[PDB]
């Protein structure tokens, strides 16, 4: 189906406690496959998925060199941000960047992304056209003008249309037996009395991949979004995911409730009920 590759950088300043930290992670769809932490003793880009370990030394050594340099770049970027925002060196600050490419089912590039944030808010972003920028404030407009004149967008466009799409197709092949395999959810409903007149119906979905999923509760066929506790989709620790949705129901009305599960690994939407038997 559709696939994507994303890189997430985090650069954190910690004045009076140590040098700024740089953490970077790589994902294919919802599977982490590489990582780098400047706080490690021997900072190295390391593998986090089995299918990537087959790459040779030039790959690991080149990624390590790039990240060591990237860390120094975001060290400078953190100082430059203090200037733009007129902030002291006493505060801790964070810069984030996430960028990557989206393949369509046809395997040709569908969209590229490159966005950056400062202290949790938008800073600057590459627009869809991969040629122009969107700046969130006056400080980012300084960065924009520099990147416009330095023709940065063009170097990024070239990476997103080229190496990013190519490596993503390369990765997708090396680990197709897990990455291009969808794992449907194993589902069921549980019953938990709250009192002698109320019970919680919980709809479970376990061990699915990818993470995208839709759980809803219906009563007599009517959605109950307003009364549904939906937890955030969570990692199981083995690269599959879990989610549940619960509704508080009055004793006796249980069988009027239905759970509907949508997941791309499913032949059809499922419709579940509590099966007390």
């Amino acid at each position: 189906g559709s696939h994507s590759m994303r890189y997430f950088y985090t650069a954190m300043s910690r004045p009076g406690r140590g040098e700024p930290r740089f953490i970077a992670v790589g994902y294919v769809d919802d599977t982490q496959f590489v990582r780098f932490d400047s706080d490690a003793a021997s900072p190295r880009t390391e593998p986090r998925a089995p299918w990537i370990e087959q790459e040779g030394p030039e790959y690991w050594d080149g990624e390590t060199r790039n990240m060591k340099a990237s860390a120094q770049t975001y060290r400078e970027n953190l100082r430059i941000a203090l200037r733009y925002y007129n902030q002291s060196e006493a505060g801790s600050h964070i810069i984030q960047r996430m960028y990557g490419c989206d393949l369509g089912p046809d395997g040709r590039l569908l969209r590229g992304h490159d966005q950056s944030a400062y202290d949790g808010k938008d800073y600057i972003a590459l627009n869809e056209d991969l040629s122009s920028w969107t700046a969130a404030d006056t400080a980012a407009q300084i960065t924009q003008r520099k990147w416009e004149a330095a023709r940065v967008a063009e170097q990024l466009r070239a990476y997103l249309e080229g190496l990013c799409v190519e490596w993503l197709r390369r990765y997708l092949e090396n680990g197709k037996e897990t990455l291009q395999r969808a794992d449907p959810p194993k589902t069921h409903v549980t019953h938990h009395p709250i009192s002698d007149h109320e019970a919680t119906l919980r709809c479970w979905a376990l061990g699915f991949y990818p993470a995208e999923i839709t759980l809803t509760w219906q009563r007599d066929g009517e959605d109950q979004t307003q009364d549904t506790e939906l937890v955030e989709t969570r990692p199981a620790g083995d690269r599959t995911f879990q989610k549940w949705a619960a509704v508080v129901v009055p004793s006796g009305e249980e069988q009027r409730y239905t759970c509907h599960v949508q997941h791309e690994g499913l032949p059809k939407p499922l419709t579940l009920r509590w099966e007390p038997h």
Partner: peptide, 9 residues
């Protein structure tokens, strides 16, 4: 493969 950073903020 990561992208190489070509400019500062």
């Amino acid at each position: 493969q990561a992208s190489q950073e070509v400019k500062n903020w």
